[PDB]
Amino acid sequence: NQSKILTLQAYDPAKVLVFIGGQRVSGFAADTKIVITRNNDNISVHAGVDGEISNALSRDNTGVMTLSLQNTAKWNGYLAQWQRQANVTGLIYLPVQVEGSQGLSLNTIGWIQKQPDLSYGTEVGQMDWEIGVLDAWLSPDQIQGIA
Amino acid sequence: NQSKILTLQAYDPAKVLVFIGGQRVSGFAADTKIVITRNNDNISVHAGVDGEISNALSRDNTGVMTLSLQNTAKWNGYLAQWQRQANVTGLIYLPVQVEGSQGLSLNTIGWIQKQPDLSYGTEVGQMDWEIGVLDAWLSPDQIQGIA
Amino acid sequence: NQSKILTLQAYDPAKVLVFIGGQRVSGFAADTKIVITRNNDNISVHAGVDGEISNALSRDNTGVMTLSLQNTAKWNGYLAQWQRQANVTGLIYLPVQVEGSQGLSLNTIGWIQKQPDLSYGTEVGQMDWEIGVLDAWLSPDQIQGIA
Amino acid sequence: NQSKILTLQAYDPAKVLVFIGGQRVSGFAADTKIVITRNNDNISVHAGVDGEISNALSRDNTGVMTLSLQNTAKWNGYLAQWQRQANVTGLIYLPVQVEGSQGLSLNTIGWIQKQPDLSYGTEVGQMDWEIGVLDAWLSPDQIQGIA
Amino acid sequence: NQSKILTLQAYDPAKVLVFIGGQRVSGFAADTKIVITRNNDNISVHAGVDGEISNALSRDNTGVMTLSLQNTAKWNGYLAQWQRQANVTGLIYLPVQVEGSQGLSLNTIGWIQKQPDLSYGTEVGQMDWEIGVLDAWLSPDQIQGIA
Amino acid sequence: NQSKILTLQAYDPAKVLVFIGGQRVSGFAADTKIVITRNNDNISVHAGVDGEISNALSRDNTGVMTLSLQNTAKWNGYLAQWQRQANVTGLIYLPVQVEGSQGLSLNTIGWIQKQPDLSYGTEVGQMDWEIGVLDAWLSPDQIQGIA
Amino acid sequence: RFSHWVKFRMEESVFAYMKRRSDMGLSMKMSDEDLPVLKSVLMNNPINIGIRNGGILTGYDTNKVSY
């Protein structure tokens, strides 16, 4: 029914901006651009023998962010240099930002957690870089009307 | 055979109402709207060497409720704000209610247990919010003729 | 070959009767009506270093019975009430019976072990109730000619 | 090529005879009639630090035999009675024999290890009885020319 | 391109000879004839806290060889007799050899490690005999021009 | 759109050169030529009770490299000889190099970690040699414009 | 002394590989597919011994450039 159109402007995936270290990322893969996850659930429940229930608030909010890039992309070079930079000098952190075109944003600092699996074949491959983000609270700021 | 029609009125999925905190939820996914589960089975059986059997009644009735929303939905904003609200202030609980159009209802309190995995790609994604419900006894109240 | 017809009367699935608590169950799912299993194998084998073999007879014969019902069925109400009844009052057991139209029967007592996963979507769902049966020896009584 | 025909008489599955307790089994399933397996491998290898190798001969030769029967078969009754017979009286063993039409035979004693999962639906089901066999050395006796 | 033809004579699978005990094996399955594997990797790496790296040479080189035979094959008889022979008399070992038509060869001693799963149905089955080989270094001797 | 062509020269897989010990490898498989992975992630995170976060730099950078070769390839001979060479004499290491036509390169030393599974059938098989590489930092040197 | 040692050993290492590669036929050739191996040839003999013994420096600076 036309009275329940959830998006009056078509969702254009190109509006989703990602900035790492202050430069705009580009050269993404075929299907998925990014994935953001947490490691720990929000609260812990300790239920007693007779049904007494008490809850605790978590204090580890770190998450992991995956970034799919075609292995022919130029940005593979910048990340590869950065790994060695941090391994020797010991400076790992780097600002990270995400723009939620019509969804949830993100703005924190992160570091390269692991390097992907490089494979060469008859087709242009793919790479999944893991950018661990220090704090992973999604922000609704892009949405209007949030009272 | 027409003498075994189990539903004389077609099951309309839009009649299933969900209220969290007193506001009606909207903006659901493509296939499944909700899923309600328990964590622990009802009773424990302790069987002796020679066949003596004795049973115990459980006292942990907590369950988990999953809520599928399109990542472009507006309700993603309300839940995202609520997480930070509770993380700092320490108020986690919130009333939850479900209307069993032609099934089982539910009416209890719950909290956001975990945040989903946000992914951006060529199609409008999806989100699976986990609303832990304190007590998960399904209610047959919507059914008539229950003697 | 027609000299090896294993059933001279077609197997009609509607002849399989199930009575729980003395009322006939109805409102089953699409493919499978029931499944009966044991938990423990019949005997234990203790084999020695040099090949001495000795066997033991089990004394835990409990099994589990699954009962598929459409989530729009009325019998979901009776089971849901029964759970709360037993949780508070402490009376769990209830007679169970099965009629093996052209197979094996069953007649024992059982209780509701767990409640299924309730899901709402674009199609009428399904529920798998677990009726733990105290003793699960299948009976050949329906078969004629068992000498 | 016709100079490498491995079977000059077509393999007829109906020649495979199975006798349990002295009566011929009948009423088998659709695809597989029987499966015979061992539990333990034949010898154990204990290799030293510097490469010294020594071997040991196993003394547990028990195996398991699966027997697929249509749930409408009459032989389900005989096995079901036998279980209760042994559970009370304590006599479990029973001779078992197999005829390898154009393969390997078997001749030993065995017992019912577990009872299958009985399921009722829109199609005639199936049952997988487990007949643990005390000794599971396959016999080539049916093959001619074994020097 | 025709300047990169890796095999100037078509690879004929029938040239692959296998001799066990001095007699040529025959009666193989449909897709795969043999598979040769090792159990342990070649060297062990012990890396220190600060990056010091040291390596060790393995001394367990045993492998496993699988041999697919149609269950109607005559060679099933010879292996079945051999098992009982070794179980009683205690002589397990037996020479094994493989001819790498256009690949790698093998020449060592081995024993029957386990017996396969015998199954009877509407189609001629298959058997996977495990011939543990004492030493599993592949030999390039069939290849010419190895300087 | 033509304003976002990520590669102005088509990616030709034949430009990817691999040198082991100073000789150019050849005779690769059908789909994938190589795969490069690490074993350990880059840094370790130790988060305290109250949210204090501290990080550590890894010092184990070893990786594994897989090399797919048709089992009829001639290079299988060179690797097979090398294994025995190192097993007896104790010299395992050997230079390894990779050319990233339009990607990331690699230049380090490595050794043969395990030997693949040799299988013979109706089709020309395949082999996956594992060349453990001592240090696995990918190099962007082939990319121009890396400031 | 360091410069003389590096010069002598680089010449030695290149010549030894080239001759051994030309003694089996299959002499080296001027092509994009054959020249890169000189990277390994040089990185092997002098450089990887100099780094291990500590004569040649390595790491990162501040100039903000690798050594």
Side-chain angles (χ1 to χ4, degrees), chain E residues 33 36 42 47 55 59 136, chain F residues 60 83 87 93 113 115 120:
Chain E
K33 286 172 56 162
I36 307 167
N42 291 358
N55 292 314
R59 287 283 167 257
Chain F
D60 283 278
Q83 283 193 92
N87 192 14
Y93 288 107
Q113 193 171 271
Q115 62 153 312
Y120 285 121

Side-chain angles (χ1 to χ4, degrees), chain D residues 25-100:
Chain D
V25 178
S26 66
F28 287 108
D31 175 52
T32 300
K33 286 172 56 162
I34 62 170
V35 184
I36 307 167
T37 66
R38 298 271 294 289
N39 296 133
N40 297 115
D41 63 298
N42 291 358
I43 62 170
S44 306
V45 177
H46 187 188
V49 170
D50 73 358
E52 300 148 302
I53 289 281
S54 76
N55 292 313
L57 303 182
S58 71
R59 287 283 167 257
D60 283 278
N61 309 327
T62 61
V64 180
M65 183 177 176
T66 285
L67 205 47
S68 301
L69 301 175
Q70 296 182 36
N71 68 7
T72 189
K74 204 172 61 43
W75 259 87
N76 296 297
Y78 301 165
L79 297 162
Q81 298 201 44
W82 186 248
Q83 283 193 92
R84 285 193 313 252
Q85 203 74 330
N87 192 14
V88 178
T89 71
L91 303 182
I92 51 180
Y93 288 107
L94 203 66
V96 173
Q97 182 181 330
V98 179
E99 301 306 79

Side-chain angles (χ1 to χ4, degrees), chain A residues 5 32 42 80 93 99 123 135:
Chain A
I5 288 162
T32 300
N42 291 358
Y93 288 107
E99 301 306 79
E123 294 293 328
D135 189 358

Side-chain angles (χ1 to χ4, degrees), chain B residues 42-122:
Chain B
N42 291 358
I43 62 170
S44 306
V45 177
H46 187 188
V49 170
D50 73 358
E52 300 148 302
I53 289 281
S54 76
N55 292 314
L57 303 182
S58 71
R59 287 283 167 257
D60 283 278
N61 309 327
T62 61
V64 180
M65 183 177 176
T66 285
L67 205 47
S68 301
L69 301 175
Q70 296 182 36
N71 68 7
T72 189
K74 204 172 61 43
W75 259 87
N76 296 297
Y78 301 165
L79 297 162
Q81 298 201 44
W82 186 248
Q83 283 193 92
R84 285 193 313 252
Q85 203 74 330
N87 192 14
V88 178
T89 71
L91 303 182
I92 51 179
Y93 288 107
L94 203 66
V96 173
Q97 182 181 330
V98 179
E99 301 306 79
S101 73
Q102 284 193 290
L104 294 80
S105 309
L106 180 79
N107 175 22
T108 192
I109 60 175
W111 67 89
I112 297 165
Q113 193 171 271
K114 207 179 160 94
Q115 62 153 312
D117 288 19
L118 175 66
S119 57
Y120 285 121
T122 59

